[PDB]
Amino acid sequence: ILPDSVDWREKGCVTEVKYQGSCGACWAFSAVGALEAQLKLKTGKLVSLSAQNLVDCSTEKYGNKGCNGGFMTTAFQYIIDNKGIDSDASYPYKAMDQKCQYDSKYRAATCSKYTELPYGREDVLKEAVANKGPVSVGVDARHPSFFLYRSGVYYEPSCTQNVNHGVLVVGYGDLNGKEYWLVKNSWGHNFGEEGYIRMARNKGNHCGIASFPSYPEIHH
Amino acid sequence: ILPDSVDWREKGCVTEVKYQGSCGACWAFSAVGALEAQLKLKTGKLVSLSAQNLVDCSTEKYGNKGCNGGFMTTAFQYIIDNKGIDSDASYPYKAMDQKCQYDSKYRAATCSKYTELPYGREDVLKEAVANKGPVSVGVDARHPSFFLYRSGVYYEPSCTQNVNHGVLVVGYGDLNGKEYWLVKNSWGHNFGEEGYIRMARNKGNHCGIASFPSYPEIHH
Numbered sequence: 226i227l228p229d230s231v232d233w234r235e236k237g238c239v240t241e242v243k244y245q246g247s248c249g250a251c252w253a254f255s256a257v258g259a260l261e262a263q264l265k266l267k268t269g270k271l272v273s274l275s276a277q278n279l280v281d282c283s284t285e286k287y288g289n290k291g292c293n294g295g296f297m298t299t300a301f302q303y304i305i306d307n308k309g310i311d312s313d314a315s316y317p318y319k320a321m322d323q324k325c326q327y328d329s330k331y332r333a334a335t336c337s338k339y340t341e342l343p344y345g346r347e348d349v350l351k352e353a354v355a356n357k358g359p360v361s362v363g364v365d366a367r368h369p370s371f372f373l374y375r376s377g378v379y380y381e382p383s384c385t386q387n388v389n390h391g392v393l394v395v396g397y398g399d400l401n402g403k404e405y406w407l408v409k410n411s412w413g414h415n416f417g418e419e420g421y422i423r424m425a426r427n428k429g430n431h432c433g434i435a436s437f438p439s440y441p442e443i444h445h
Numbered sequence: 446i447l448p449d450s451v452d453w454r455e456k457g458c459v460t461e462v463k464y465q466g467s468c469g470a471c472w473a474f475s476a477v478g479a480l481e482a483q484l485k486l487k488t489g490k491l492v493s494l495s496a497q498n499l500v501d502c503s504t505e506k507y508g509n510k511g512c513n514g515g516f517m518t519t520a521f522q523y524i525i526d527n528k529g530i531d532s533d534a535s536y537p538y539k540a541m542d543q544k545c546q547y548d549s550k551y552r553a554a555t556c557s558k559y560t561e562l563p564y565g566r567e568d569v570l571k572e573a574v575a576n577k578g579p580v581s582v583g584v585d586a587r588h589p590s591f592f593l594y595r596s597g598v599y600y601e602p603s604c605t606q607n608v609n610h611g612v613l614v615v616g617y618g619d620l621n622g623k624e625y626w627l628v629k630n631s632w633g634h635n636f637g638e639e640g641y642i643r644m645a646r647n648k649g650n651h652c653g654i655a656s657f658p659s660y661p662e663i664h665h
């Protein structure tokens with residue numbers, strides 16, 4: 226029986242909201258956020274990981290295009306292949322494409338595997354967020370209403386399953402009879418509810434939130 | 446220990462080569478080809494499955510755009526969710542977007558699940574082709590050499606891991622020192638080696654062939 230609500234911020238597994246600026250690196254922020262939680266679960270330490278390291282290093286071999294987009298799964302595979310990712314403090318975010326500057330001296334996490342959830346299954350996504358941790362997802366963030374979200378549970382009749390923006394599901398619940406996913410964005414604290422958006426849950430895979438979920442793991 | 450060469454056509458698990466014509470339905474052909482093999486393994490029948498059913502019915506809610514492209518994995522999820530796919534004979538291919546005409550009375554196959562292989566791992570792809578069946582993959586077909594291919598092992602110096610064309614790996618082997626993946630295309634029998642292309646194997650994930658591999662399975 227799954228909990229009726231989850232919020233991984235209550236377990237110290239979520240870092241401060243980040244600001245991606247004019248660089249389309251949401252995929253990199255989504256991927257580091259999922260791995261940050263697993264790092265906390267394994268080591269007890271909450272550490273922001275380097276989205277810039279993914280932008281600069283998880284590049285064309287990984288199907289990624291830096292500030293012009295990419296994939297959370299292939300970011301995970303780069304972390305596996307590279308045998309590490311640097312901390313954000315060591316390898317800070319510049320919102321630009323740069324030369325690869327990875328250095329194992331500054332490694333703050335590893336990754337051993339990743340899992341992709343089945344397409345559109347919000348029950349399976351609920352299980353994963355309850356039992357595994359925060360889950361990387363894509364959402365359709367194209368609609369003017371998304372940018373203007375301030376409160377409540379986001380439901381946009383014009384939303385599609387054509388996803389364009391990587392984000393992080395850190396929880397779920399029910400507000401005033403509306404089920405929601407708790408989503409951490411990378412547009413700074415100004416966006417939404419201190420950087421978060423509650424997005425409609427069990428409303429037909431609204432905005433594609435359960436289309437392409439993935440999460441990493443760190444083994445012994 | 447894996448076999449040095451595999452060809453699923455010798456196992457009776459590969460249908461005749463199809464012709465997509467002016468419709469970008471490669472994803473749909475790739476998906477039905479992978480499931481046709483599993484249907485043969487479960488039932489003993491080799492049956493062409495309806496790519497048109499996927500074009501018409503695995504649409505916006507699956508992130509697909511019919512003749513303008515789509516995903517093999519979300520095609521598999523459509524078949525799971527729909528509890529079926531029709532035969533090609535009952536629901537033939539017209540190389541255009543149509544209204545959904547699925548009818549369960551023409552069901553030829555089901556799907557219980559699908560598996561996405563880890564990114565870029567040609568050894569894992571080899572294991573899957575040897576032990577599970579033909580595998581749906583994407584390749585970078587954005588080079589004139591792919592269109593002009595006639596025979597032998599295809600290697601394109603300009604190839605990338607930015608994949609755009611869904612195809613089916615039906616085997617692997619080597620041509621006098623040159624390892625290859627045996628790929629079934631959907632550009633008719635005049636393409637390549639009577640519909641097939643042998644693509645370079647163990648050459649750094651050449652043309653992204655091991656970027657995004659998936660295969661479906663049928664209950665039992």
Ligand SMILES: CS(=O)(=O)N1CCN(c2ccc3nncn3n2)CC1
Binds near residue numbers: 251297341362391392
């Ligand atoms: C950057 S994004 O968050 O908008 N989004 C783009 C789509 N991505 C896909 C696409 C097909 C697919 N099949 N399996 C996993 N995916 N993931 C996920 C990342």
Ligand SMILES: CS(=O)(=O)N1CCN(c2ccc3nncn3n2)CC1
Binds near residue numbers: 609612
């Ligand atoms: C139509 S295609 O054959 O060129 N190709 C497009 C890319 N697709 C992706 C994309 C991201 C992704 N992340 N994980 C799994 N995939 N699959 C697979 C299908």
